[PDB]
Amino acid sequence: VDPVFSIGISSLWDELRHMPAGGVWWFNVDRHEDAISLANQTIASQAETAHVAVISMDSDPAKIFQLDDSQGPEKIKLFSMLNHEKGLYYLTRDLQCSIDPHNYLFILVCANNAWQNIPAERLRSWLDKMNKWSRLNHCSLLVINPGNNNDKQFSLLLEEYRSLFGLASLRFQGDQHLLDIAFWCNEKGVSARQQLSVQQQNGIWTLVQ
Amino acid sequence: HCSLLVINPGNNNDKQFSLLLEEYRSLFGLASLRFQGDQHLLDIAFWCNEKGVSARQQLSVQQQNGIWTLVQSEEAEIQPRSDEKRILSNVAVLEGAPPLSEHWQLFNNNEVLFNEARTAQAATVVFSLQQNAQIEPLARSIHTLRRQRGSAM
């Protein structure tokens, strides 16, 4: 009954696009502009009846996140937080105060190297609590992290594959970008360790086959 | 802290199989074995353990004198590659230089290194050879590592 959402990359398979609400998916990107472009394309790629929110840091979200005039939901509930760990710690309560989070999609676009200061243990606890809250309130959380050297953090995320429902990364390679899908769990099955190439044509992420 | 092994004998569980496919959140791994006259085709839709997650693997096994042995197609994908950047090297390979990154783990000889590499899946293992007497044991260790830990290594 709960609707499933899609990721913002065109010409991509439904096995790696659909995110059934009620879990946590994680994304890494090499550059901040890539993060914002992916977030905007995800917002523009949602169904009209879907309920989507965006949380941003170190900026005014009304000026950096856009909406297409032809596709997507009628409106989105932008949010904003301090560039601090306490914002992520309180995210659940803060969103519960202002919104009923049942059947929602939450895009969390952090700042450059924002997740660098969060210790491993508190990141594990955050992922566990977010997974439990997502299962309890039937909401989905997408995390987009523009970073450079999160190899220790990426190994940490891999160790926590129970908390997450999907981990993917986006790396810059000059003219194209490499998508590394560590795993994905959706309605149509489970994937494991693909590598795919995606390009940016007119600001739209299109898969090159 | 207990594990459950559900063994389900069934013939027409196609709807049940689809339900179990959807039921990822309650199942670490769904595995199916199909009898095909002379051998058994093992079809693991997904499987998870402390070494990662494997998904959509089909293997062939045969029952020889009541034992389950994998067919010689034992070069099937070791899907998870979580230590693709870990470098397990003998201490002699780095001629006193500091480890280049956090990914370098040093070992005293090529027997502790072999023991640690028996658990790796995609790491680079660098052995050090200083005498001709340790070529045959090194060959045997390399053979065991290659025949058990797959092609990703």
């Binding site: 949380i55 005014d60 009304a62 996140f65 409106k75 989105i76 932008l78 306490k86 309560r93 519960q96 | -």
Partner: protein, 47 residues
């Protein structure tokens, strides 16, 4: 007297049990009403 006291007792017992069962519901409604967003402040529903 004691009879009506016991009647009220019974009433408040499952009454207090149902109120406890709706702990989560009560918490959510109170958070929606009082509304303390300490760090995450909704910037505004964009069109």
């Amino acid at each position: 007297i004691i009879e009506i006291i016991v009647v009220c007792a019974l009433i408040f017992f499952p009454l207090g049990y149902l109120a406890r069962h709706s702990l989560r519901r009560i918490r959510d409604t109170l958070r929606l009403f009082f509304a303390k967003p300490r760090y995450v402040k909704p910037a505004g529903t964009l069109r």
